[PDB]
Design a protein around this ligand. Structure first.
Ligand SMILES: C#Cc1cnc2nc(O)n(C(CC)CC)c2n1
Ligand SMILES: [Ca+2]
Length: 152
């Protein structure tokens, strides 16, 4: 835990103390059994609950690209990286788009599309979301060396 060379450490460092305190409630979003690991099913349930409707392949992919253990599983730090992923690409991503083409007040609705991490957390947490969403990034990014090959 001292030799920070993983993606979880980054996630933990890209957030803020009070915001992490709010993320504590994230376990309640689905609530497996009061203490357990979450899989594509459980996760897919919560995310489809916001109106979106993807495939298991989508769920696995987003977890796999961050899963260093080679097993998509959500967990203490594994959960954290998930939440940061949406805000990460929204702040500094390449190709990632919320499909928003109107940055105004009379803008389109939820549309059941990939919206901001803020909007989703507001729905997932059930309006408990009040912390300031600050993703520590800038106008700098590059290609990652992360590319896995395995099918389960
Ligand atoms: C629950 C949940 C959750 C948390 N963090 C995410 N970051 C993402 O990109 N997603 C989905 C789209 C909402 C990927 C398909 C995330 N779902
Ligand atoms: Ca895992």
């Amino acid at each position: 835990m001292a030799s920070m060379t993983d993606q979880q450490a980054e996630a933990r460092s890209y957030l803020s103390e009070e915001m992490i305190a709010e993320f504590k409630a994230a376990f309640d979003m689905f609530d497996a059994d009061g203490g357990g690991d979450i899989s594509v099913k459980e996760l897919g349930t919560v995310m489809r609950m916001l109106g979106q409707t993807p495939t298991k392949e989508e769920l696995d992919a987003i977890i796999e690209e961050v899963d260093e253990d080679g097993s998509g599983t959500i967990d203490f730090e594994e959960f954290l990286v998930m939440m940061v992923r949406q805000m990460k690409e929204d702040a500094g991503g390449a190709g990632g788009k919320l499909f928003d083409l109107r940055g105004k007040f009379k803008r389109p609705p939820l549309r059941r599309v990939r919206m901001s991490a803020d909007a989703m957390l507001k729905a997932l947490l059930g309006s408990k979301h009040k912390v300031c969403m600050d993703l520590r990034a800038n106008l700098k990014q590059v290609k990652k060396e992360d590319h896995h090959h395995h099918h389960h």
